[PDB]
Amino acid sequence: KDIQDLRTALVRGYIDNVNNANYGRYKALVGAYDRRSLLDNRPGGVVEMERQDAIDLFPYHNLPQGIDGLLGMSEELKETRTGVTKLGMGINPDVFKNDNAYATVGLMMNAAQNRLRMVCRNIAHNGMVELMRGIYNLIRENGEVPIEVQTPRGMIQVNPKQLPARHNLQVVVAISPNEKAERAQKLISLKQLIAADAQLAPLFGLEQDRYMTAQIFELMGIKDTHKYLLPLEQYQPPEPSPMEILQLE
Amino acid sequence: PVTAGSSSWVDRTVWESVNGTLQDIINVFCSGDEAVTFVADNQQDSDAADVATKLVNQILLRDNPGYNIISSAAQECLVTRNSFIKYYWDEQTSVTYEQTVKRVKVEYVPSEQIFVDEHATSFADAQYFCHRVRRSKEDLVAMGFPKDEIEATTQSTVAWSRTDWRQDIDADIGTDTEDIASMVWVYEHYIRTGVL
Amino acid sequence: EYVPSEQIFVDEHATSFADAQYFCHRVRRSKEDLVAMGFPKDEIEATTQSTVAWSRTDWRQDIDADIGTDTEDIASMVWVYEHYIRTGVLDKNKESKLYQVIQAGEHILHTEEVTHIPFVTFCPYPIPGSFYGQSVYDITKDIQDLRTALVRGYIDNVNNANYGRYKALVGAYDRRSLLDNRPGGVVEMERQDAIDLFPYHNLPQGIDGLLGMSEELKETRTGVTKLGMGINPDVFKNDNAYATVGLMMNAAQNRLRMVCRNIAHNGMVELMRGIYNLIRENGEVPIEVQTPRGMIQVNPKQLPARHNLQVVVAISPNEKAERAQKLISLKQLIAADAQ
Amino acid sequence: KYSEEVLDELRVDLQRRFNYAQGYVDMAVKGYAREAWEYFYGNLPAPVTAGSSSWVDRTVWESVNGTLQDIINVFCSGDEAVTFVADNQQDSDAAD
């Protein structure tokens, strides 16, 4: 409120001095005035008088060196009590979770940007986290919610009261727009880790492998059961080749 | 604008500050594909976390105008000193076509239709609350006083009427009060007291 | 089709499409629709703000003038009054629903129940608890006035001093010599204090110099810059998409991406949700199945609802590229396994 | 179908609401949108006098389309505009 008041008054004081000075005055009595001739608007005048000390530009008030200059830095005053800048970099959900996410050159760790992380953090833990918890309790005590199961792509009528409470459920806010991306590589990294061992290979059999590739694909390519992957219900084991049979015999 | 010759120019630092903050708030919360992702501490109940995550995302975004709610609750909070959000159980109903459903509606609530006590600090410790809402008579007739529907605070209108200048909430829209779907203000209340 | 902002009439006590109690939409329509619906035996049927606005959306158009054809012509272009009101068409005892109304001059054409308003609005930099937000004009009107008036007060000084005036005393003018248009001296005068530069007013250092930085004021309350850094569809979904050097942390983009994120969530995402809803309760949609190029008349009713469906807007022109790399990356992973 | 007496009451109730609606819209917005277009064209800033050096700056004109360098560049820049996504393979064949 204070910033707007001062900046308004200072600019208002700036304007009228400019408006007075830009469209100028002159000074000369009736003596040597030459009223008829002076009214010519042509910059290339053809007539003057012979006094040579009569007319001069009006002594308009000069623009003060300090009155407007030292309030030109009132901009950073807003930069101190707020967190907005006409040239600074914005914020993102990833750096919201961890400031050192872009520690390469996007250190992100500035008063200009970590101060805006105040309200978003404050509004999240004073706001939405209560919103989900309120909704989660609210949805838990009324109605019957049907949930689509993905095993047959069917529908199951699940009792909402069988749902657990907020005690064993944790909520997070401000997910990244690409949170699909990093999860896909995480599964691939975990997939190659377990594949590197053999003592988990019986445990990580064939039914597990399909839907992992689906989920990795589901983040980008959803409909895999028709062109990309075969459903588990139709993956009949292959009959052994006659070459193997005769080798056995 | 004290005088015509005073060059009544006005600075808009307040407007720039709010927009600068908003350029980041929506860029963080309402920028991702979804809004929230419930996570559990164990797996054998994580079969409920994903279900809840999809349910609220379906409700907040795929069903409700979540983008409007968050944006309105943002631009109208940095100036109003607070903002409020309401969720409620819908009971809308209609060849005997009498389909009835139940929905969890979420709508933004301006900080002007709200009345709170003084010695309270939070929702839980608050002892009294009020919430002025324009409601249709159709909701009222369905459960009370079906035989009389001729039912007929400036500050509560001024602030919203000064959120802009082409709109006024207390003005006469044009629809008659006799209409079954005509709107009328109500007095929502949440108070801890001896009803018994 | 698009809808102008002048052809809409909404009550003051509304804040959004759903809660609106009355609604009108002034539409020009041809009589072909009208004759196929009523009053076939009479077709001689014949608001300045609704004309001035588009008469001043440019200076080369008007909407209330006569195009020329007679009013008897069926293709003659005729105003109608589309209406969407929640009121007691039946007795008020029932909770009043919403009924679409289309009516002509002292005549009514069609009334029907509908559960969703078919219009969608765009609102950048909105205002909560209201139906109409703010505008770039409402922010940039003042800067235009001050900048223009500054140049106007500037230019009037520009031409005055440009028109070089020489004033001397009555004596020693020597009019015959001075008025020569050739600036080459062949005619001259000793006294050296008759002719001198007119004391033209100089340029105010503060009136115009201090206000020359008004450009930054525009770049703060908006996101515009003559050389600034903007936004792209990829960075819209993820700011760190180009986190190499493009941190995006500039006020010119963050206060700019608020409106585009809003105009999505407050705008077209309702349209596709509306588009997905509408296609679900009318007609039979014939779709193409990709196996034999067979042609299947799939019923729209079997389609799911928006409850389990998520919509995304502002796709990238190269999504076909990175999706292909996602598939081949997924392909080599599953190929590496035998299970 | 509906009795004409209902329609006669419908006309009166609809008309009075239309009169109320247009009054608010005209004063609040159409009185400003009318001038906003003219500033967008740089013509309403008054040429008070021929000697007043009637130049007009069009800062609104650069600002109004200023975001629009990005508006069309993000929504309507790609091969298409929108694409639906589902939550399960049961309806994934319908989203496309």
The nearest CA of chain C is from the CA of A229 a distance in Å of 10
User: How crowded is the C-beta side of A140, counted as CA atoms within 13 Å?
Assistant: 14
CB pair distance less than 8 Å for C93 and B142: no
The span from the CA of C167 to the CA of C160, in Å, is: 15
Residue of A nearest to C216 (CA): A86
Q: Are B183 and C21 in contact (CB under 8 A)?
A: yes
The nearest CA of chain A is from the CA of B3 a distance in Å of 11
A105 touches chain C (CB under 8 A): yes
Q: Which amino acid is at A26?
A: Y
CB pair distance less than 8 Å for A223 and D92: yes
* Of residues C94, C307, C312, nearest to B63 (C-beta): C307
Q: Which chain C residues are within 8 Å of B99, Cβ to Cβ?
A: none
The phi and psi torsions of B104 (rounded to 5 degrees) equal -105, 90
HEC-encoded secondary structure of chain B: CCCHHHCCCCCCHHHHHHHHHHHHHHHHCCCCCCCECCEECCCCCHHHHHHHHHHHHHHHHHHCCHHHHHHHHHHCCCCCCCCEEEEEECCCECCCCCCECCCEEEEEECCCCEEECCCCCCCCCCCCEEEEEEEEHHHHHCCCCCCCCCCCCHHHHHHHHCCCCCCCCCCCCCCCCCCCCCEEEEEEECCCCCCC
The span from the CA of B67 to the CA of D64, in Å, is: 23
The nearest CA of chain C is from the CA of D23 a distance in Å of 9
* Helix-helix angle A2-22:B13-28, to 10 degrees: 130
Q: Are B164 and B157 in contact (CB under 8 A)?
A: no
- Which helix (H) or strand (E) segment is A145 a member of? strand A145-148
Q: Which amino acid is at B102?
A: K
Length of chain A as a residue count: 249
The span from the CA of C58 to the CA of C301, in Å, is: 46
Length of chain B as a residue count: 196
CB pair distance less than 8 Å for C240 and A92: yes
b/e per residue B129-158 (b: at least 16 CB within 10 A): bebeeeebbbebbeeeeeeebeeeeeebbe
Surface-to-core class of residue C289, CB atoms within 10 Å of its CB (0-12 exposed, 13-18 middle, 19+ buried): exposed
Q: Which amino acid is at A89?
A: M
Q: Taken in order D45, D47, D48, D52, is the CA torsion positive or negative?
A: positive
The span from the CA of C99 to the CA of C82, in Å, is: 11
A235 touches chain C (CB under 8 A): no
- Which helix (H) or strand (E) segment is A169 a member of? strand A169-170
The terminus-to-terminus CA distance of chain A in angstroms comes to: 94
Helix count (H) and strand count (E) of chain D? Answer: 5, 1
Q: Tell me the C-alpha to C-alpha distance, in Å, between residue C207 and each of A20, B8, C89.
A: 8, 15, 64
* Of residues B166, B168, B179, nearest to D29 (C-beta): B166
Q: Which chain C residues are within 8 Å of A177, Cβ to Cβ?
A: 237-238
The span from the CA of B112 to the CA of B188, in Å, is: 14
Q: Which amino acid is at A180?
A: K
Longest dimension (CA), chain B: 75
Surface-to-core class of residue C12, CB atoms within 10 Å of its CB (0-12 exposed, 13-18 middle, 19+ buried): buried
What is the DSSP-derived secondary structure letter of residue A126? Answer: I
Q: Are A51 and A32 in contact (CB under 8 A)?
A: yes
* Of residues C153, C219, C329, nearest to A22 (C-beta): C153
A/D interface, count of CB pairs below 8 Å: 29
A/C interface, count of CB pairs below 8 Å: 229
Experimental resolution (Å)? 4.2
The span from the CA of C84 to the CA of C11, in Å, is: 12
A41 touches chain C (CB under 8 A): yes
CB pair distance less than 8 Å for A176 and B23: no
C339 touches chain A (CB under 8 A): yes
Structure-token pair, residue A43: 């910059």
User: How crowded is the C-beta side of C247, counted as CA atoms within 13 Å?
Assistant: 21
Q: Which amino acid is at B61?
A: L
CB pair distance less than 8 Å for C163 and A62: no
The span from the CA of A33 to the CA of C39, in Å, is: 82
Write down the experimental method used for this entry.
Answer: cryo-EM
* Of residues A18, A177, A201, nearest to C206 (C-beta): A18
HEC-encoded secondary structure of chain C: CCCCCCCEEECCCCCCCCCCCEEEEEEEEEHHHHHCCCCCCCCCCCCCHHHHHHHCCCCCCCCCCCCCCCCCCCCCEEEEEEEEEECCCCCCCCCCCEEEEEEECCEEEEEEECCCCCCCCCCCCCCCCCCCCCCHHHHHHHHHHHHHHHHHHHHHHHHHHHCCCECCCCCCCCHHHHCCCCCCCCCCCCCCCCCCECCCCCCCCCCCCHHHHHHHHHHHHCCCCCCCCCCCHHHHHCHHHHCCCCCCCCHHHHHHHHHHHHHHHHHHHHHHHHHHHHHHHCCCEEEEECCCCEEEEECHHHCCCCCCCEEEECCCCCHHHHHHHHHHHHHHHHHHCCC
Q: Is the backbone of residue B178 left (phi > 0), alpha (psi -120 to 50) or beta?
A: alpha
Q: Which chain B residues are within 8 Å of A134, Cβ to Cβ?
A: 87
* Of residues C154, C203, C206, nearest to A68 (C-beta): C206
Q: Are A61 and A33 in contact (CB under 8 A)?
A: no
Q: Are A155 and A197 in contact (CB under 8 A)?
A: no
Q: Which chain D residues are within 8 Å of B174, Cβ to Cβ?
A: 13-14, 16-21
The phi and psi torsions of D51 (rounded to 5 degrees) equal -80, 0
- Which helix (H) or strand (E) segment is A210 a member of? helix A207-218
* Of residues C165, C193, C219, nearest to A45 (C-beta): C165
* Of residues D16, D25, D87, nearest to B166 (C-beta): D25
A91 touches chain C (CB under 8 A): yes
Q: Are D37 and C56 in contact (CB under 8 A)?
A: yes
CB pair distance less than 8 Å for B8 and A120: no
Chain C segment 217-246 residues within 8 A of A by beta carbon are 219-220, 237-241, 243-245
C327 touches chain A (CB under 8 A): yes
CB pair distance less than 8 Å for B168 and D24: yes
The span from the CA of A97 to the CA of C196, in Å, is: 72
The span from the CA of C178 to the CA of A47, in Å, is: 9
3-state SS, residue A147: strand
Task: Please name every residue paired with C103 in a beta bridge, in sequence order, or none if there are none.
Answer: C81, C108
Q: Which residue, C55, C4, C40, C34, is CA-closest to C104? A: C34
Task: Please name every residue paired with B93 in a beta bridge, in sequence order, or none if there are none.
Answer: B100
The span from the CA of C6 to the CA of A76, in Å, is: 42
CB pair distance less than 8 Å for D90 and A152: yes
